[PDB]
């Protein structure tokens, strides 16, 4: 790789994020603020997405 090269021959850095978006228990999450847990009412819920 040289600084003079045409763009198709210039270096690019690549990062590929593979998600194990499985039914398995989570350890990487978005910054979502959790609530207290309501029971015995009809409610909306969001457990780990």
């Amino acid at each position: 790789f040289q600084p003079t090269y045409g763009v198709g021959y210039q270096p690019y850095r690549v990062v590929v994020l593979s998600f194990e978006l499985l039914h398995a228990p989570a350890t990487v999450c978005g910054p979502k603020k959790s609530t207290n847990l309501v029971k015995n009412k009809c409610v909306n819920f969001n457990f780990n997405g």
Partner: peptide
């Protein structure tokens, strides 16, 4: 040497709970 496996070697196919059900 050799021997018969019978019904050995089954494992849970995915990390989901299921109960009172037959799953293919």
């Amino acid at each position: 040497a050799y021997t018969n496996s019978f019904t050995r070697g089954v494992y849970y196919p995915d990390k989901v709970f299921r109960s009172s059900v037959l799953h293919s």
